[PDB]
Amino acid sequence: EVYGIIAMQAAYRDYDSGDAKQDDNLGGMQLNNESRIGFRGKKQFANFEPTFIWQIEGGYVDPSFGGEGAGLGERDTFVGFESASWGQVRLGRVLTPMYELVDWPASNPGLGDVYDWGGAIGGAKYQDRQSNTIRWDSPMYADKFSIDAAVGAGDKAGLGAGDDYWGGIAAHYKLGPLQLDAAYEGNRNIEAEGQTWENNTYLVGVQGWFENGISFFAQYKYMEADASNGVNEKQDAMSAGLMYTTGDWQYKLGYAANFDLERDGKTLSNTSDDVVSAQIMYFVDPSAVLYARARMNDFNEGLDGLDDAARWTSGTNGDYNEYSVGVEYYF
Amino acid sequence: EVYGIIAMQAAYRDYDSGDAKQDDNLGGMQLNNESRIGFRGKKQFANFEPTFIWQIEGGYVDPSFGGEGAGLGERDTFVGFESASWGQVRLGRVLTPMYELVDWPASNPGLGDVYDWGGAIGGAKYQDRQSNTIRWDSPMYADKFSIDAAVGAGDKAGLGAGDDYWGGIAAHYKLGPLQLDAAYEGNRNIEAEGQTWENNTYLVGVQGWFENGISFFAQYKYMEADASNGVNEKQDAMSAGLMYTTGDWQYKLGYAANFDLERDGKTLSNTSDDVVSAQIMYFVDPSAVLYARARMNDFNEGLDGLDDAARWTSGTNGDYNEYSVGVEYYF
Amino acid sequence: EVYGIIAMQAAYRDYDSGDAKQDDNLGGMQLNNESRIGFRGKKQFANFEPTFIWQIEGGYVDPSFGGEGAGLGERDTFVGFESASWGQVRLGRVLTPMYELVDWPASNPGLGDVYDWGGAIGGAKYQDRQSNTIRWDSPMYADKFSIDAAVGAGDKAGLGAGDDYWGGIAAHYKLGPLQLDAAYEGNRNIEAEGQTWENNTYLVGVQGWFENGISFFAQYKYMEADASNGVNEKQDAMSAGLMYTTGDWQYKLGYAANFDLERDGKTLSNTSDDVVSAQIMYFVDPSAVLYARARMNDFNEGLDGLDDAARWTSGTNGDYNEYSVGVEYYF
Numbered sequence: 001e002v003y004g005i006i007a008m009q010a011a012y013r014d015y016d017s018g019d020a021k022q023d024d025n026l027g028g029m030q031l032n033n034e035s036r037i038g039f040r041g042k043k044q045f046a047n048f049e050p051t052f053i054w055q056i057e058g059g060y061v062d063p064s065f066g067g068e069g070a071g072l073g074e075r076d077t078f079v080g081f082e083s084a085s086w087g088q089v090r091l092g093r094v095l096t097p098m099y100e101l102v103d104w105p106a107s108n109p110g111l112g113d114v115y116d117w118g119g120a121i122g123g124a125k126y127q128d129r130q131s132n133t134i135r136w137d138s139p140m141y142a143d144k145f146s147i148d149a150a151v152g153a154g155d156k157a158g159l160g161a162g163d164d165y166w167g168g169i170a171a172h173y174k175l176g177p178l179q180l181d182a183a184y185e186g187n188r189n190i191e192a193e194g195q196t197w198e199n200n201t202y203l204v205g206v207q208g209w210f211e212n213g214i215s216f217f218a219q220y221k222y223m224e225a226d227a228s229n230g231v232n233e234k235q236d237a238m239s240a241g242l243m244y245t246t247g248d249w250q251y252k253l254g255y256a257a258n259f260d261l262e263r264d265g266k267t268l269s270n271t272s273d274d275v276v277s278a279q280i281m282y283f284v285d286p287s288a289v290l291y292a293r294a295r296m297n298d299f300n301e302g303l304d305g306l307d308d309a310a311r312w313t314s315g316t317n318g319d320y321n322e323y324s325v326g327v328e329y330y331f
Numbered sequence: 332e333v334y335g336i337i338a339m340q341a342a343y344r345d346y347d348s349g350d351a352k353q354d355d356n357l358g359g360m361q362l363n364n365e366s367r368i369g370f371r372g373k374k375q376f377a378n379f380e381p382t383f384i385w386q387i388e389g390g391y392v393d394p395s396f397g398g399e400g401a402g403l404g405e406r407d408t409f410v411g412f413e414s415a416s417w418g419q420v421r422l423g424r425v426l427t428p429m430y431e432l433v434d435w436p437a438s439n440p441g442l443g444d445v446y447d448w449g450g451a452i453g454g455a456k457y458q459d460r461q462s463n464t465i466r467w468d469s470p471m472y473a474d475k476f477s478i479d480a481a482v483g484a485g486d487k488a489g490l491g492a493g494d495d496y497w498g499g500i501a502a503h504y505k506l507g508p509l510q511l512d513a514a515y516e517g518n519r520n521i522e523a524e525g526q527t528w529e530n531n532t533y534l535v536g537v538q539g540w541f542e543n544g545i546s547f548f549a550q551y552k553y554m555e556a557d558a559s560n561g562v563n564e565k566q567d568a569m570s571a572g573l574m575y576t577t578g579d580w581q582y583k584l585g586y587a588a589n590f591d592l593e594r595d596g597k598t599l600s601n602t603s604d605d606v607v608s609a610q611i612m613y614f615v616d617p618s619a620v621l622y623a624r625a626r627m628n629d630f631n632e633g634l635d636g637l638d639d640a641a642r643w644t645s646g647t648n649g650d651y652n653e654y655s656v657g658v659e660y661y662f
Numbered sequence: 663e664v665y666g667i668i669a670m671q672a673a674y675r676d677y678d679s680g681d682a683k684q685d686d687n688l689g690g691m692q693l694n695n696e697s698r699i700g701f702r703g704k705k706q707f708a709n710f711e712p713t714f715i716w717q718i719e720g721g722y723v724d725p726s727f728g729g730e731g732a733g734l735g736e737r738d739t740f741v742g743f744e745s746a747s748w749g750q751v752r753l754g755r756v757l758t759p760m761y762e763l764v765d766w767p768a769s770n771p772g773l774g775d776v777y778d779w780g781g782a783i784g785g786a787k788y789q790d791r792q793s794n795t796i797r798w799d800s801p802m803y804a805d806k807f808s809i810d811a812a813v814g815a816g817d818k819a820g821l822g823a824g825d826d827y828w829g830g831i832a833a834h835y836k837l838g839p840l841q842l843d844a845a846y847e848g849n850r851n852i853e854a855e856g857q858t859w860e861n862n863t864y865l866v867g868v869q870g871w872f873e874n875g876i877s878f879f880a881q882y883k884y885m886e887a888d889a890s891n892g893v894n895e896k897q898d899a900m901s902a903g904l905m906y907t908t909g910d911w912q913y914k915l916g917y918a919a920n921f922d923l924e925r926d927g928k929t930l931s932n933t934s935d936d937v938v939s940a941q942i943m944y945f946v947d948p949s950a951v952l953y954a955r956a957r958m959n960d961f962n963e964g965l966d967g968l969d970d971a972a973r974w975t976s977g978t979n980g981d982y983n984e985y986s987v988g989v990e991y992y993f
C-alpha cells in the first residue's frame with residue numbers, strides 16, 4: 001500500500017542577523033514542501049505468530065532552504081514484528097523514544113528551531129532518526145500505560161567512522177483526560193570538539209484534552225553532558241502550548257525556550273533561546289487541514305566549544321520572524 | 332494515482348571539438364533512460380469549493396551522461412487548487428510559463444541544446460522548471476483564449492544564498508487551426524560573473540494543425556540582460572518545425588538557432604548556434620511511440636563573461652551530431 | 663506494478679586490522695537494510711508482436727556502512743521486448759551475463775567480499791550492474807539450454823569521460839539434476855593506474871539440487887588483465903557452497919578464494935583472499951526466510967598498482983569476522 005502525506009507551507013521569513021547581505025539571503029519567501037510518499041505493509045508468516053511488518057517512507061520532496069528530490073527510506077524505514085500481547089519491535093530507522101515527544105507535542109506550532117535542535121550543549125543531546133536501531137513499543141497496558149524503549153548505533157558509527165551508541169526509554173500514562181510523559185536518552189562515545197562526550201538527557205511532560213475545547217502540553221527537558229577531558233555542561237528547556245478548539249477551528253499558542261548554559265559550574269551569559277508563535281487552523285476535511293502561523297525567534301549570542309572554536313547552534317544563523325500559510329493532507 | 336512515462340533513447344553522438352580525446356570521451360553510444368514515476372491526485376475538501384490537487388513526479392532514472400537513480404519530486408511537484416470559474420493555481424515546483432513554450436512546440440526534436448538552455452547571453456535568461464513558485468492557469472475563455480502567469484523565487488534564493496526572484500506570463504489564442512503563443516519572463520537579482528543582472532525575455536510563436544496532415548510551429552525569442560555595472564547584452568533566436576502525418580507516421584524537420592550576441596551594441600562575432608534535425612515516428616500503440624531521428628548541432632566559438640573568464644554555453648563541449656532510436660510509453 | 667523486496671540484516675562485524683581505532687570504527691553492530699522497491703510492467707503494443715516490458719527498481723534504502731535514502735533506478739532499470747520465438751532483449755541498466763553467475767550462486771552466504779568485488783587484478787575484472795547496456799536473454803531451448811549475451815558502455819564512458827566498453831556471454835545447459843554453467847566477459851579501454859587495460863574473465867561452474875536434500879555449487883573464475891605499458895596480470899579464484907535441506911530448514915556452508923596474483927610471470931607474495939561461512943536458514947513463509955550466519959575473511963597484505971601507489975582491494979580495511987541474523991521478504 002502507498003500512503004502519502006501532502007504538506008505545503010508558504011513561509012516568508014524576516015531575518016535580523018546584523019549583516020544585511022546575509023539577511024537578504026536567509027530571509028525572503030520560500031515554499032517548504034514536506035510532502036512524502038511511502039510504502040508499508042504486513043504479512044502473516046505461515047510459521048510465525050508475530051506479524052511481520054515493514055515500511056519504507058521517502059523524504060521531504062522539496063523542503064525550504066534545500067534542493068528538490070528525496071529518495072526512499074529517508075524517513076521511518078524499517079522491518080519488525082508485532083504481537084498483541086507484547087507490542088511491537090522494529091529494526092531500522094525510527095524515532096528515538098524521547099524524540100517522539102520533542103516533536104509531538106513539544107515542537108507543535110513551529111517551535112522546533114528552539115526545542116528540537118536549538119541547543120547550546122556540546123556532545124549530542126538526543127537523536128532525530130538513527131538508521132541502526134532496535135526499538136520496542138509496549139502495548140497499552142489496561143489501555144492506559146505504555147512503555148517505549150530503544151537502543152541503536154550512533155551517527156558516525158553507522159558509517160564505520162566511530163563507535164557512537166545510544167539508548168533511550170520513555171513512558172506514558174493516560175489518567176482520565178491527562179497524559180504524563182517521561183523520557184531518557186543517553187549517548188556515548190560522541191566525538192565532537194576534539195573530545196569524546198557522554199550525554200544524559202531527561203524529559204518530563206503532560207497533556208490534556210477537555211470537552212470545553214482547551215488542549216495543552218507542557219514539558220521540561222534537562223540536558224547534561226560530560227566531556228572526556230573532564231568538562232561538564234548543563235542546559236535545560238521547556239515547551240508549552242495552549243489551544244482552544246471550536247467547531248472546525250483551532251487557535252494555538254506555543255512557547256519554547258532553552259535557558260542559559262552552564263559549563264563547569266560557570267554560566268555562559270546570553271546563550272538562551274526563546275520562541276513565541278501563534279497559529280490558526282481550519283479542519284477543511286476529515287483528511288486535511290489549512291493553517292496560518294506567525295512566530296518570533298530570539299537566539300543566543302554565541303558559544304565556543306571545548307576546542308577554542310565556536311560551536312554551532314540553531315541560532316548560529318541569527319534571529320528571525322516568520323509568517324506562513326500551509327496545507328497538509330493525509331492518505 | 333501512479334503515473335509513469337517510460338522513455339528510452341539509444342543515441343550515438345559524433346562530437347567535433349578540436350581535441351580527439353574529448354571527442355572519444357564525449358562521443359560514442361549511450362542509453363538515455365528518461366523514464367519517471369510519479370504520484371498525483373485530486374481531493375474535494377468537504378469544507379471548501381475548490382478541488383485540491385497535488386502531484387509528486389520523480390526524475391529521470393538514468394539519463395545519458397549521468398549517474399543512476401533520481402528521487403521523487405525532481406520534476407513537476409506541487410500542490411494547488413482549481414475551480415472551473417477562475418482556473419487553477421499550483422504552488423511548489425512547476426515549469427515557468429515561457430519555458431512551456433520553449434520546451435513543447437519549440438525544443439523537440441533535439442533543438443533543446445540550442446533553443447532550450449543553449450543561449451550565449453549573460454545573466455539568466457529564464458527558468459527551466461524552478462521550485463518555490465506559484466502558478467495560475469486560466470480557463471479557456473470564450474473557448475478561444477487562455478492565459479498563464481506565475482512568480483517564484485530564484486535559484487540562489489531558494490537556498491538562502493541570495494535574493495533572486497522572477498515573474499512571467501504567457502497567453503494563447505486559437506484562430507481556427509492556428510494557435511498564437513506569446514510570453515514574457517524577467518529575472519532580477521541574478522548574481523553571476525561578479526555582477527548582478529536583470530534579464531528580460533520575450534517570445535512570440537504560432538502552431539497549426541491541418542486536416543490534410545500538415546502541421547508546423549514557428550517561434551521568435553527575444554533575450555535581453557542588463558548588468559549592474561551598466562553593461563547590456565541582447566541576443567535573439569528562433570525555432571521552427573514542420574511535420575507531415577500520414578496513417579501511423581509523423582515525419583518531422585526542425586530548425587532552431589541562437590543568433591549573434593551584442594554586448595553594449597557591439598556584436599560579438601561567431602557566438603551563434605543552430606541545430607538541424609529530422610525525425611521519423613511510428614505510433615506503435617495508442618499508449619506508446621517509436622522513433623528514429625538524426626540531428627546536427629553547430630555551436631558557438633566562445634565568449635568571455637564580464638569577469639575576464641570564459642562563459643559556459645551549450646557549445647562549450649563542441650559541435651556534435653547524433654543518431655538515435657527511442658521508445659516512449661505512457662501509463 | 664509495484665514489487666518490494668524487503669530485506670534487513672543485523673550484522674556484528676569484528677575487525678582485526680592492526681590499528682584498533684580502525685577496528686572500533688569499522689567493527690561493531692550495524693543494521694544493513696537492503697529493502698528495495700521497484701516498478702515493472704508489460705504492454706502489448708497494438709501495432710507490434712514483441713511484447714513491451716519495462717522496470718524501474720530502487721536501490722538499498724539503508725545499507726550498512728552507508729547513509730539513508732536511495733533514488734529510483736539504482737538497480738535493474740530497463741526497457742525491452744520479449745517474444746516466444748527469440749527470447750528477450752532489454753536496454754538500459756542490467757546485470758552483466760557473468761556477474762549473474764558470480765552473484766548466484768557463488769557469492770552468498772557472505773562470500774561476495776572475496777568472490778564478487780574482491781580481487782587483486784588490475785584494470786576492471788568485470789562489471790557488476792551496468793547502465794548503457796543491451797542484453798539479449800535467450801529462451802530455454804529444448805527446456806534445457808539457454809544463452810545470455812550483452813554489450814554495453816563502460817563505467818567512465820557513461821558520464822562522457824572516456825570510451826571504456828565491454829561485452830559478455832554465458833551459457834547454461836541442464837543435464838538432469840545438474841546444471842553446467844560457463845561464462846565470459848571482456849573489458850576494453852579501461853583507464854587505471856596511468857595505463858589502459860583490457861580485461862578478460864572466464865567462469866565455469868556447476869549447480870545441483872537433489873530430492874535427497876543435498877544441493878551444491880562450485881565455480882572457477884579465471885581473470886587475466888593486460889596493461890598499456892605491456893604488463894600482464896593474472897589472478898584466478900574459486901567458490902563453492904554445499905547445503906542440506908530438512909523440512910523448513912537449510913543448512914549452508916560456503917567457501918571462496920582468490921589466489922595469489924601473478925604479474926609478468928612472477929607471483930606477488932600473500933595476495934590471496936579466502937572466506938568461509940556457515941548459515942542456518944528458516945523458510946518461515948513461501949515468500950520469506952529467517953537466517954543466521956557467521957563468516958571469516960582473511961584478505962591480502964597489499965599490492966602496489968602500476969603507479970607505485972597502493973591498489974585498493976576488499977582487504978584494504980583488514981581481516982574481519984561477522985555474525986548476523988536477517989530477514990528476506992518478497993513483493
Ligand SMILES: CN(C)c1ccc(O)c2c1C[C@H]1C[C@H]3[C@H](N(C)C)C(O)=C(C(N)=O)C(=O)[C@@]3(O)C(O)=C1C2=O
Nearest residue numbers: 394396443444447448449458459460641642643644645
Ligand atoms: C556556468 N554553469 C552554471 C555551469 C558550470 C559548470 C558546469 O559543469 C555546468 C554549468 C551549467 C549547467 C547547466 C545544466 C542545465 N540545468 C539542469 C538547468 C541543463 O538543463 C543541462 C541539460 N543537459 O539539460 C545541462 O547540461 C546542465 O546540467 C549542465 O551540464 C551544466 C554544467 O555542467
Ligand code: NA
Nearest residue numbers: 127128129155
Ligand atoms: Na542523528
Ligand code: NA
Nearest residue numbers: 137138146148
Ligand atoms: Na508506543
Ligand code: NA
Nearest residue numbers: 394395396820
Ligand atoms: Na548513462
Ligand code: NA
Nearest residue numbers: 458459461486
Ligand atoms: Na534555474
Ligand code: NA
Nearest residue numbers: 468469477479
Ligand atoms: Na494553461
Ligand code: NA
Nearest residue numbers: 025027028488
Ligand atoms: Na532569500
Ligand code: NA
Nearest residue numbers: 789790791817
Ligand atoms: Na560498474
Ligand code: NA
Nearest residue numbers: 799800808810
Ligand atoms: Na537467461
